[PDB]
Design a binder for these strands. Structure first.
Ligand SMILES: Nc1nc2c(ncn2[C@H]2C[C@H](O)[C@@H](COP(=O)(O)OP(=O)(O)OP(=O)(O)O)O2)c(=O)[nH]1
Ligand SMILES: [Mn+2]
Ligand SMILES: [Mn+2]
Ligand SMILES: [Mn+2]
Length: 430
DNA sequence: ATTATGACGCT
DNA sequence: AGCGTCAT
């Protein structure tokens, strides 16, 4: 009752750029705009691997992790842009630099947590309080929410998309308690006004469109963001959670799309998020551990406490390349040459990071995969990173891995390596 | 031959 | 520290 918490203390948004790498290439090359198009890495094997897909191309069934040749079977007029290749490997610098453009704009409105190259959480609680105090009580016009959906509305007692969106928004606004500066629904609504402004600024100043979710925590904001893509934002209120979760497959919630989610389904004999409410907190902890159990108990009621961390820069700067099938590395000269290539890209990126961001990495993590190993990484070892020098970094990586060569011959490398990965970590201010 | 990342939890 | 999971 009056003491049972409802997880409505914050306003959190998740902003995700639509088909980002595609939008970056479409900005650069206007011939690709408003077309079925995709971004690919490499080209020789099956046309290259697709990693991003415009919504026009998605309508034909084109997806990520599809070979370009197969995509062309679904969509013969598909247009393709290729990721840059430098030092023999894919180089993602163009997309990282575009990401910094967007993140710097977002940071003008609130402190952000960079969750990926293309998405960031926003803690809007304080900005909402500000705008409400500037809002001397007058209601929020629908004109301030021109791209907002209210999940679950319209309901109760026109056959167009935009008409439905507007009906739901009008039902929502009509029911608003605009006189109460502590009303969570009002706070979410003002958060959505701010996110409209942030998304408008991103598009005006970069050309890029995005989607967003507004709710009371990170998981609901992420889920909300996915409900109406592209170029739209969705408000998920606390009150919308019972209906939303009653038909929500457990795997759709962030962190439950893998083995843990499958075990929730198999152990409890349930399918949907809402079914979790019938278990006690102790029951869930008994199956899934104390941390997971408390998290699930709260999450299935719409409640989650993970903070938006004030972190707009990545914590690690890494370089990796797979050597699949017959391209696996089988000589010492080969291994050394590719370690050097990776280390030279790493040096370039680290030196730019030090100039931009006033910090230096201090640990080098070296990871490899050996042929026939099912795991992504067969081995991970760390060593000291004391100098931003590619030859030193590659020599050190070779020293940390050289005992994995089981070949008696010092010239050959066996079993051959199917992955190399260098990662700079443990930053200190400088 | 589903690639190049990046974050975080466990012990 | 080194490994596993999750995201995509
Ligand atoms: N190199 C590489 N990049 C990836 C991979 N998966 C995704 N990316 C990149 C390309 C995408 O444009 C970008 C953002 O990922 P998202 O899941 O947010 O999808 P995207 O923005 O493409 O589409 P959407 O958000 O659904 O509109 O990340 C991958 O496996 N390898
Ligand atoms: Mn995206
Ligand atoms: Mn994303
Ligand atoms: Mn995607």
């Amino acid at each position: 009752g009056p003491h049972m918490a409802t997880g409505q203390d914050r306003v959190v948004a998740l902003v995700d750029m639509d088909c980002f790498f595609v939008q970056v290439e479409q900005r650069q090359n206007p011939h690709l705009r408003n077309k079925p198009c995709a971004v690919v890495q490499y080209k020789s094997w099956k046309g290259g691997g697709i990693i991003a897909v415009s919504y026009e191309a998605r309508a034909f069934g084109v997806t990520r992790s599809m070979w370009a040749d197969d995509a062309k079977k679904l969509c013969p007029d598909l247009l393709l842009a290729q990721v840059r290749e430098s030092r023999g490997k894919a180089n993602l610098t163009k997309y990282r630099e575009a990401s910094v453009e967007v993140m710097e704009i977002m940071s003008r409105f609130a402190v952000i947590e960079r969750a990926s190259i293309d998405e960031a959480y926003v803690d809007l609680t304080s900005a909402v309080q500000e705008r409400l105090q500037k809002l001397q009580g007058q209601p929020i016009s629908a004109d301030l929410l021109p791209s907002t959906y209210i999940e679950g509305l319209p309901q109760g007692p026109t056959v167009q998309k935009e008409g439905m969106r507007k009906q739901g928004l009008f039902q929502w606004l009509d029911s608003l308690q605009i006189d109460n500066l502590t009303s969570p629904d009002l706070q979410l609504t003002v958060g959505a006004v701010i996110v409209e402004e942030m998304r408008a600024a991103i598009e005006r100043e970069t050309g890029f469109q995005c989607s967003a979710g507004i709710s009371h925590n990170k998981v609901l904001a992420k889920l909300a963001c996915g409900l109406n893509k592209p170029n739209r934002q969705t408000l998920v209120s606390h009150g919308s959670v019972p209906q939303l979760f009653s038909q929500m497959p457990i795997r759709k919630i962030r962190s439950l799309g893998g083995k843990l989610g499958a075990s929730v389904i198999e152990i409890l004999g349930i399918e949907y998020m809402g079914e979790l409410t019938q278990f006690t907190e102790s029951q869930l902890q008994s199956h899934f551990g104390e941390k997971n159990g408390s998290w699930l108990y709260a999450m299935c009621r719409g409640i989650e406490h993970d903070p938006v961390k004030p972190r707009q820069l990545p914590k690690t700067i890494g370089c990796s390349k797979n050597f699949p099938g017959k391209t696996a590395l089988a000589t010492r000269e080969q291994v050394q040459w590719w370690l050097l290539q990776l280390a030279q890209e790493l040096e370039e990126r680290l030196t730019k990071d030090r100039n931009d961001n006033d910090r230096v990495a201090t640990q080098l993590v070296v990871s490899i995969r050996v042929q026939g190993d099912k795991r992504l990484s067969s081995l991970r070892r760390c060593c000291a990173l004391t100098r931003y020098d590619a030859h030193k970094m590659s020599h050190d990586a070779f020293t940390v891995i050289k005992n994995c060569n089981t070949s008696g011959i010092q010239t050959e490398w066996s079993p051959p390596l199917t992955m190399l990965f260098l990662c700079a970590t443990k930053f200190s201010a400088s």
